[PDB]
Design a protein around this ligand. Sequence first.
Ligand code: FMN
Length: 356
Amino acid sequence: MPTLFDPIDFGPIHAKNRIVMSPLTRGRADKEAVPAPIMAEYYAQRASAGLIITEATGISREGLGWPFAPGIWSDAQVEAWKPIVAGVHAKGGKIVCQLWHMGRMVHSSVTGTQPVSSSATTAPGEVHTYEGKKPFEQARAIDAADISRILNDYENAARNAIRAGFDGVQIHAANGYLIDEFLRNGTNHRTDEYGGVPENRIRFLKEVTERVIAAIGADRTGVRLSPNGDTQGCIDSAPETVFVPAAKLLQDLGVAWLELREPGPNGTFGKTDQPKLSPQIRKVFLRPLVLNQDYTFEAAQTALAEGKADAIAFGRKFISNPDLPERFARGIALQPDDMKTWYSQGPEGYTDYPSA
Ligand SMILES: Cc1cc2nc3c(=O)[nH]c(=O)nc-3n(C[C@H](O)[C@H](O)[C@H](O)COP(=O)(O)O)c2cc1C
């Protein structure tokens, strides 16, 4: 019954439509992870999205490896995010901060410390640094003092997001970052209460989510999961046995909304033959369910008509179509995105894609 053009409530967040801007790392902050003024223009250009999910935003230096990505642990960062968020609100938009701990996906040259993870494992390929790509480093398996600290960092980051004026947060529990490295049995080789059976592998997600909810409210908390397909060396051998229970826990804790990134067999941002778990998750998580990856306008419209999702998040289309909702409403061709400038430092390929 819903179309992409119909409004939706994400908890108390009143979105004007169901065309979500997915989280996109762009690397237009400074080397100190403080947002830069150009980011205000980039997000204001995209304020017609029913909801913007920010680029992944580091909760701590330990968890933030991506060159020129922002953080939200410090008041300098909070003060720089304030005008960015204000410019979206002034255009009638809504925006949530995606809270990031990268886990084993960082390089020590950026963070100053060894990568941390569920287990002492190594991501495949090479990692981005300020001196170019380097081999990934084997992580260290976090202990109870580290868990306490990391929970504190999620708590503080969530508080700071609200302090900056964000409408809410999304916990980044996807794409082979720290939480995902606990969830999936390909990365989690722990012997303690955080390893082994699915309820143990969900425990870290549970504790992060509980601490964010206690800080800012369940109704202001969303989560992203990526249940299916290897992403950055992280895969589960039987994802339904951990991700359907994870989604149910989130439902029971009061989490306001859930986004699933789901590659398919012919996916163009990763691909996989692991089946998509959205149909099973839709039956256990009953609040707004946002799906993502490879959606066209007609596939998205059909998903909402068939009750498969309440909203769809678009990533690459929002890179090059700041006015994606208007282009869809008006049948205007979608401008191609320039992959060479996804992660570069310029305004080129960032704030210089025109609106219709
Ligand atoms: C340049 C770029 C940066 C991205 N950064 C993030 C990110 O910060 N957080 C995240 O959860 N996903 C990130 N993603 C994944 C997207 O949110 C999205 O899942 C992906 O682009 C597929 O959806 P699409 O087919 O609509 O583009 C990124 C994708 C791209 C292309």
